[PDB]
Design an enzyme around this catalytic site. Structure first.
Site, PDB file in Angstrom:
ATOM      1  N   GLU A   1      -5.277  -3.201  -7.180  1.00  0.00           N
ATOM      2  CA  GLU A   1      -5.642  -3.838  -5.918  1.00  0.00           C
ATOM      3  C   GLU A   1      -6.659  -4.948  -6.177  1.00  0.00           C
ATOM      4  OE1 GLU A   1      -4.279  -3.293  -3.147  1.00  0.00           O
ATOM      5  OE2 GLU A   1      -3.390  -1.287  -3.221  1.00  0.00           O
TER       6      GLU A   1
ATOM      7  N   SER B   1      -5.990   3.751   3.718  1.00  0.00           N
ATOM      8  CA  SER B   1      -5.467   2.666   2.882  1.00  0.00           C
ATOM      9  C   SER B   1      -6.594   1.941   2.148  1.00  0.00           C
ATOM     10  CB  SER B   1      -4.625   1.688   3.703  1.00  0.00           C
ATOM     11  OG  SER B   1      -3.527   1.204   2.939  1.00  0.00           O
TER      12      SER B   1
ATOM     13  N   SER C   1       0.796  -1.226   0.000  1.00  0.00           N
ATOM     14  CA  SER C   1       0.000   0.000   0.000  1.00  0.00           C
ATOM     15  C   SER C   1       0.829   1.277   0.000  1.00  0.00           C
ATOM     16  CB  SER C   1      -0.953   0.031   1.196  1.00  0.00           C
ATOM     17  OG  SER C   1      -2.140  -0.689   0.912  1.00  0.00           O
TER      18      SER C   1
ATOM     19  N   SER D   1       1.092  -3.276   3.848  1.00  0.00           N
ATOM     20  CA  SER D   1       1.221  -4.657   4.285  1.00  0.00           C
ATOM     21  C   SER D   1       0.713  -5.572   3.184  1.00  0.00           C
ATOM     22  CB  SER D   1       0.472  -4.923   5.596  1.00  0.00           C
ATOM     23  OG  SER D   1      -0.926  -4.793   5.430  1.00  0.00           O
TER      24      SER D   1
HETATM   25  C1  YPP Z   1      -3.877 -13.190  -4.113  1.00  0.00           C
HETATM   26  C2  YPP Z   1      -4.532 -11.803  -4.076  1.00  0.00           C
HETATM   27  N1  YPP Z   1      -4.137 -11.093  -2.819  1.00  0.00           N
HETATM   28  C3  YPP Z   1      -2.708 -11.115  -2.401  1.00  0.00           C
HETATM   29  C4  YPP Z   1      -2.500 -10.795  -0.834  1.00  0.00           C
HETATM   30  N2  YPP Z   1      -3.454  -9.750  -0.327  1.00  0.00           N
HETATM   31  C5  YPP Z   1      -2.970  -8.742   0.676  1.00  0.00           C
HETATM   32  O1  YPP Z   1      -1.860  -8.789   1.057  1.00  0.00           O
HETATM   33  N3  YPP Z   1      -3.886  -7.691   1.196  1.00  0.00           N
HETATM   34  C6  YPP Z   1      -3.383  -6.723   2.173  1.00  0.00           C
HETATM   35  C7  YPP Z   1      -4.186  -5.413   2.021  1.00  0.00           C
HETATM   36  O2  YPP Z   1      -5.158  -5.393   1.356  1.00  0.00           O
HETATM   37  N4  YPP Z   1      -3.730  -4.167   2.710  1.00  0.00           N
HETATM   38  C8  YPP Z   1      -4.512  -2.943   2.539  1.00  0.00           C
HETATM   39  C9  YPP Z   1      -3.988  -2.170   1.359  1.00  0.00           C
HETATM   40  O3  YPP Z   1      -3.476  -2.780   0.389  1.00  0.00           O
HETATM   41  O4  YPP Z   1      -4.063  -0.901   1.343  1.00  0.00           O
HETATM   42  C10 YPP Z   1      -4.455  -2.070   3.834  1.00  0.00           C
HETATM   43  N5  YPP Z   1      -3.072  -1.549   4.003  1.00  0.00           N
HETATM   44  C11 YPP Z   1      -2.455  -2.152   5.235  1.00  0.00           C
HETATM   45  C12 YPP Z   1      -1.493  -1.189   5.819  1.00  0.00           C
HETATM   46  O5  YPP Z   1      -1.522   0.023   5.477  1.00  0.00           O
HETATM   47  O6  YPP Z   1      -0.630  -1.585   6.658  1.00  0.00           O
HETATM   48  C13 YPP Z   1      -3.599  -2.494   6.247  1.00  0.00           C
HETATM   49  C14 YPP Z   1      -3.172  -3.598   7.209  1.00  0.00           C
HETATM   50  C15 YPP Z   1      -4.064  -1.214   7.027  1.00  0.00           C
HETATM   51  S1  YPP Z   1      -4.880  -3.050   5.200  1.00  0.00           S
HETATM   52  C16 YPP Z   1      -3.536  -7.269   3.572  1.00  0.00           C
HETATM   53  C17 YPP Z   1      -2.445  -7.247   4.447  1.00  0.00           C
HETATM   54  C18 YPP Z   1      -2.581  -7.751   5.741  1.00  0.00           C
HETATM   55  C19 YPP Z   1      -3.812  -8.280   6.163  1.00  0.00           C
HETATM   56  C20 YPP Z   1      -4.902  -8.303   5.287  1.00  0.00           C
HETATM   57  C21 YPP Z   1      -4.767  -7.798   3.992  1.00  0.00           C
HETATM   58  C22 YPP Z   1      -4.789  -9.707  -0.802  1.00  0.00           C
HETATM   59  O7  YPP Z   1      -5.619  -9.101  -0.202  1.00  0.00           O
HETATM   60  C23 YPP Z   1      -5.142 -10.423  -2.051  1.00  0.00           C
HETATM   61  O8  YPP Z   1      -6.269 -10.435  -2.423  1.00  0.00           O
END
Ligand code: YPP
EC number: 3.5.2.6
Length: 260
Positions: A139, A103, A43, A210
């Site tokens: 995303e 985010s 992010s 993250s």
């Molecule tokens: C295979 C597809 N795929 C790959 C992996 N993935 C993610 O890594 N989503 C991440 C996500 O959508 N993160 C959100 C984002 O991309 O702003 C938000 N940014 C993080 C931050 O600023 O630290 C948050 C924890 C406030 S959520 C996620 C990370 C940790 C826990 C849940 C979600 C997915 O959601 C996904 O659909």
């Protein structure tokens, strides 16, 4: 140096891979740890999408007030603000603030669409001299953070220099730069990351990130009281696809840096 041995020790204790870049604007000195290795941005890439739209508004003066419709099909995995406006509109200003301060992933995808796709976000990076940044996906798949995959990565050194240009430099017009700084200062997700390792009197604007592989990122601009501002980028990723976030590692890195 002293700081680099402490960062290396912190990395060793964490079991992951840590990337740090600090720019001290007082004399333009830098502190780098794995400064030229690529890390998944997750992010933290949202800062570039918001800045790219701000750059467009220097010519399209009313662009930020343009309404954008939020449909149920637009919602992805994490849309804390966009969900409050489904079947309604949000302005590009509100979407940029949502992307940065909460985010919001739907807000990010709308910003990418406004720029004509991920290639349009990457183009803005090139236009301000960042040849390292690359955005390849939307995303939520840009967060896969697969080891060795160059997609949706940058290096700590490049992101620190670019964040300096955007917030303290003149890559954006005066009004746009102030708007970006205001948004970063009002981030709501950063309390346990870089902010947690710094004196409470220091003013911080940051964007966290993250993703998979325990990827835990934070990029920040820091205004110490009575001292020139600093730019600090902290990237962290781990070997296990299901590893937990380690925001404490980012706080510890900031604390180690602030000891200098
Ligand atoms: C295979 C597809 N795929 C790959 C992996 N993935 C993610 O890594 N989503 C991440 C996500 O959508 N993160 C959100 C984002 O991309 O702003 C938000 N940014 C993080 C931050 O600023 O630290 C948050 C924890 C406030 S959520 C996620 C990370 C940790 C826990 C849940 C979600 C997915 O959601 C996904 O659909």
């Amino acid at each position: 140096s002293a700081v680099q041995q402490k960062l290396a020790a912190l990395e060793k204790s964490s079991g992951g891979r840590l990337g740090v870049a600090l720019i001290d604007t007082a004399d333009n000195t830098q502190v780098l740890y794995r400064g030229d290795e690529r890390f998944p941005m997750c992010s933290t890439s949202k800062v570039m999408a918001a800045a790219a739209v701000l750059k467009q508004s220097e010519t399209q003066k009313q662009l930020l007030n343009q309404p954008v419709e939020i449909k149920p099909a637009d919602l992805v995995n994490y849309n804390p603000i966009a969900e409050k406006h489904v079947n309604g509109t949000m302005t590009l200003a509100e979407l940029s603030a949502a992307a940065l301060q909460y985010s919001d992933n739907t807000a990010m995808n709308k910003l990418i669409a406004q720029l004509g796709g991920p290639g349009g976000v990457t183009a803005f990076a090139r236009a301000i001299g960042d040849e390292t940044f690359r955005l390849d996906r939307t995303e939520p798949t840009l967060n896969t953070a697969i080891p060795g995959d160059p997609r949706d990565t940058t290096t700590p050194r490049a992101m620190a220099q670019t964040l300096r240009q955007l917030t303290l430099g003149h890559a954006l017009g005066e009004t746009q730069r102030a708007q970006l700084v205001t948004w970063l200062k009002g981030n709501t997700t950063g309390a346990a990351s870089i902010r947690a390792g710094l004196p409470t009197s220091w003013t911080v604007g940051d964007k966290t990130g993250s993703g998979d592989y325990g990827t835990t990122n934070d990029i920040a601009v820091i205004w110490p009281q009575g001292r020139a501002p600093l730019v600090l980028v902290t990237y962290f990723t781990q070997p296990q696809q299901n590893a937990e976030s380690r925001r404490d590692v980012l706080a510890s890195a900031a604390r180690i840096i602030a000891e200098g």
